[PDB]
Amino acid sequence: SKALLSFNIESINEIVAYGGKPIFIGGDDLLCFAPVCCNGNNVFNLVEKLSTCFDQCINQHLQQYINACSEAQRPLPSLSFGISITYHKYPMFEALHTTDYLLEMVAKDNLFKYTLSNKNILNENMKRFILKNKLAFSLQKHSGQIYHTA
């Protein structure tokens, strides 16, 4: 809880310093509206800064668990990111749906899990193939050219 609160405060500070707007940052959830590029920094620079802040807070407040999971060879807490860049006149509801789709379905690999679970073949060996720590990014131009990657 201490690590999450510290990360939330530092993420608010970083979003304000970059030049964006914090919508909601609480627990493990973050929602921000930021410029594509301003004062030389990009969106991906902000994402890297947020990931660094999360890692720093995890190290600072969870050092015992980090040390235990280091030699035990177990994954550490991580942040999955979903970035959508759209024209300012593009509907905000569609942009938010695109961001949710990116984050959940691609960045959290919920497409694999959802397709497996709808057919009831999730099992455990298949659950071994759930991939986290992903960045989903999509840029839709004014002509709908949409560049997307993960």
Partner RNA sequence: CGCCACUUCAUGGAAAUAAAUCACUCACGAAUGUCUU
User: Interface residues with Mn ion (CB under 5 A)?
Assistant: 28-29
Tell me how far CA of residue 2 lies from CA of 9, 30, 57, 80, 81, in angstroms. Answer: 11, 16, 9, 20, 22
DSSP β-bridge partners for residue 55: none
Q: Which of 24, 87, 114, 129 binds RNA (CB under 7 A)?
A: 87
CB closer to Mn ion out of 40 and 75: 75
- The three-state secondary structure class of 73 is coil
CB closer to RNA out of 145 and 149: 145
DSSP β-bridge partners for residue 26: 29
The kind and range of the H/E element at 58 are helix 43-61
- If phi > 0 it is left, if psi is from -120 to 50 it is alpha, else beta; for residue 40 that is left
Q: How many residues bind RNA (CB under 7 A)?
A: 8
**Residue 149 makes contact with RNA by CB under 7 A:** no
**Residue 1 makes contact with RNA by CB under 7 A:** no
The listed partner (RNA, Mn ion, none) that binds 87, CB under 5 to 8 Å by sort, is RNA
Q: Cβ 146 to RNA, closest distance in Å?
A: 9
**Residue 64 makes contact with RNA by CB under 7 A:** no
CB closer to Mn ion out of 29 and 71: 29
Rg of the chain in Å (alpha carbons): 17
Residues near RNA (CB under 7 A): 87, 89-91, 141-143, 145
